[model samples]
Target: GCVSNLMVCNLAYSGKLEELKESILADKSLATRTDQDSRTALHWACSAGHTEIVEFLLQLGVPVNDKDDAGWSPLHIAASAGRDEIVKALLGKGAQVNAVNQNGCTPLHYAASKNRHEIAVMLLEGGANPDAKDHYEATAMHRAAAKGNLKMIHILLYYKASTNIQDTEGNTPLHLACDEERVEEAKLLVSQGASIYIENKEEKTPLQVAKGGLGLILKRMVEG
Candidate 1:
C-alpha cells in the first residue's frame, strides 16, 4: 500500500515519467489507486504539468474525468496550474470540457481566475461557454475582471462573454473590478458597456465603493 501510494504520487509529481511508466506497467491497478485525498496518479501528474505522464495515463485507459474529494478533475488541476499542453491532453482524452466542481467552477473559470489566457482560449475553442457561471453566478469574465486581467477579459469578451452579467450579490463584473481597485478592468468594462450606475445588494454603486481607494485619473473614468 505504501509503495502504491508513494510511488504513484512521487513519480507523477516529481516528473519521473520513466519510473512511473514502469511502476504502472508492473501493476496496472496502481493507476486507479487513490491517495487519502482520492487523488489518483493522473491528478498528480496533471497538477504538476507532466504532459507525458498524463498522455500515458490516458492511453492506459485511466478515467479522465475522475473527480477527487474536492470534485476537481485532472482537467481542472491542469487549467488551474496554467498547463496548456496538459489541458489539451486531457481534452483530447475526452475530459469533460464543462465539468463543474463542488462550487460549480469549470476549467474555464479556473483558467480565467489564474490568468491562463492561452488555456482559456484553448478551452473556448474546445466548446467551453464563456457565459457559464459558478455557484455564485460569476462567469469567467467576472473572475478576469476581478483580478484586473486585461488580456483575459479581452479574450472572454472577444468570445462573446456578456459584460452585464451579475453575481449572487447582484454585483456586475465592473463592480468587482472597482471593489478590488482594478482600475484598468473597470475602465475596460465601462468602455464595453458596463453600467457604472448599477448597484449591488448593499445598494452601493461601484464608484461609491471605489472612490476612496482609487486615484483621480481612474475616478474620472468611472464617473464618466
Candidate 2:
C-alpha cells in the first residue's frame, strides 16, 4: 500500500500517465493516501496542473476537498497555479469554493497574491470570498497592494473586497503598500476606503512609513 501510495504521489506530482494508471489499477485505494505532508495525490496533481490525473483521482473517489497538512485543498492548488480548467473541474467535483487554508487564505487570496486576474475572476464568480485573510492577517487586497499591481487591486475592489480588513499587525493594505515602496498602491487603497489611521505591529501607518516619495501616493490619496 505504501509503495502504491508513493507511486500515486509521484505520478500525480509529475503527471506520469502510465504510472498513475498502474498504481490506481493495482490497489485502487491509493487514491486517498497522503504523503508525509498529508498531501494526497489529488493535491499534488492539482498543484502540478495535471488535469487528466486530477480527473482520474476524482473518479476514483479521492476527496477533492481534502486538506493537506498545510490546509490547502486541490482547489487552492489549482487557483495558485492559475489552472483555470482544473479549478473548474475541482469545483464541479464539489470542492469548497471559499475554504480557508491553514494560513486563512482562500483560493481567491492565492489568485490575488499572484496577480492572476482571470483566475481571481473565476474564483469570485465561483463564490470565493474576496475579503478572506491569511494567518498573517493580510487579505487578498494587501497582497495585491504590496506588489503595487493596480490591475489586481482593481479586481479585488470590483468584487467589493473589504477595504477595512486588517492583518495580524492591524495594518491595512495601504500599510503593506507603503512598506513595499508602492506609493501608487497606497494611493489606490486609500481612495477605496482604507483608513489612514490604521497602524501596524510597530504602530505605524502609511504616513509614518513614507519618509520620502514613498509618501507621495499615500499623501495624495489622503489629501483627496
Candidate 3:
C-alpha cells in the first residue's frame, strides 16, 4: 500500500495537508514510507517549509532522525534551507541536534555555510557543538568566515567557536577570512584575538596569505 500511492507522497512534498490527511486516512502507513531517494514525509514537509505538516507528521510518530540516502535528516534539510520554524519544530520533536550527514557536516555547518545566522544560533542553543567538523575537517566557524558572514561569524564566536581550529589544509578561520578577502570578517576575528601568526600546512600564516595577494591592504592596516 505504501509503494502504490504516489499521491500521498506528492501531497506530502507539496504541503497539501488536507489531501495528505485524506490519503493517510486511506492508508495509515503512507506517512511512514520513504521515496526513492529515502526521503520521508517529514523530510519533504520540512524541506517544503510546511511547519504545520511537519508537526502533524511528528505527531503521527514519524522518525524524527530519519536520514535520506545522502544521510541528511530533516533537521539538516531545514537548517540548510533556512527554515527556522521547521528547525525549532524538529528540535522540539527530539531531532538529533548533532547528527552528521554523509559528509560529516552537522546542521550547524549547513546553517553557517548558508549564512543562516538565526538558524545557526538556534542550532547552537539547541546543543550543537560549534566545533563540529565536516568531511574536509573544517568547522562551522571556518565556513562562516569563508563565506564572509559577519553575523554568522559573530554568532559562532559567541558560542565559543574556536578561532584556532584548523581545517584539513591547516587553515584556521582567520586564514580563510584572509584568503577569501573577507576584510571586515578578518578584522572581527582579529579583534576577537585570532592570531595572524598561525601558519597553515604550507607554513603560510594569515598575514602571509593576506599580503601575498587579495587582502594586502587590510594586512598593512592591521600591521601598521
Candidate 4:
C-alpha cells in the first residue's frame, strides 16, 4: 500500500522516461493512479517539466482534462509552466481550453499574469476566452493593465478584448493601468478606446484614481 502511494508520484516526478514507460505500462492501473490530491501523472509531468514523460503518459491515456484538488487541469499546469509543446499535445487531445481553476482563473490568466506571452497567444489561438474572469472578476485584460504589460495588453486588444469591462470593484483596465502608475499601458488603453469616464466602486473615474504627471497627461489627453 505504501509503495503503491509512492509508485506513480515519484515515478512521474523522477523525470526518467524509460522508468515510467516500463513501470506504468506494465500495469495499466498504475498509469492512471491519482495522488492524494487527485493529481494524476499529467500534473507531475507538466509541473515538473518532464515533457518527454508527459508524452508517454498521454500515450498511456493518463488524465489530461483531469483536475487536482485545486481544480487545476493538466493543460492549466502546462500553460502556467509555459510549456508550449505540452500545451500543444494536450490541446491536440482536446484539453479544456477554458478550464477554470479554484481562483476562477483560466489558462489565459496564467499566461498573462505569469508573463507567458507566446502561451497567451497560443491560448488565444486555441480558443481560450481572452476575457475570462477571476475571483475578483478581473479578466486577463485587467491583469495585463494592472501589471503594465503593454505587449500583453496589445495582444489581448488585438484579440478584441474589452478594455472597459469592469471588475467587481468596477476598475476598468484603464483604471488599473492608472492606479498602477503604468504610463504606457494607461496611455495605450486610452488611445485604444478605453473609457476615461468610467467610474469604479469608489465612484472615482480613472483620472481620480490616477496621480502625478500621468494623471495630468490623462487629463490633457481627455481635454486637449
Model 1: per-residue Cα lDDT over 1-224, one tens digit each: 13235568778988899999999999999988898778888998887888889989888998999899999999899999988999988888788989999999999999988888889988998889889989999999889888889999889988888988889998889888888889878878887877767778999777776755553444566664
lDDT of 3 by residue, 58-101 (tens): 88877899898999999999999889999998888888989999
- Indicate whether candidate 1 or candidate 4 has the larger lDDT: 1
Off by over 4 Å in 3: 1-5, 212-224
What's the TM-score of each model vs. the native? 0.86, 0.83, 0.90, 0.93
Highest-scoring model, lDDT: 1
Q: Candidate 2: which stretches are off by over 4 Å?
A: 1-5, 25-27, 59-61, 201-203, 213-224
How far in Å is the alpha carbon of 202 misplaced in model 1? 1.5
Best by TM-score: 4
TM-score of predicted model 4?
Answer: 0.93
For candidate 2, what is the lDDT?
Answer: 0.80
Kindly give the number of clashing pairs for every candidate. Answer: 0, 2, 0, 0
Give the range of the ten consecutive residues with the poorest summed lDDT in model 2: 1-10
**Model 4 lDDT per residue over 1-224, tens place:** 13125567677776767777787768778777788888767788788778888888788676688888999998899988888888888887788888899999899999898888888888888889887889998999988899988889889999889889999999998999988899989999888888888989999999989988787788778779
Residue 8 lDDT in model 1? Answer: 84
Model 4: ten consecutive residues of lowest lDDT: 1-10
lDDT against the true structure, each candidate: 0.86, 0.80, 0.84, 0.84
Range of the 10 consecutive residues with the lowest summed lDDT in candidate 3: 1-10
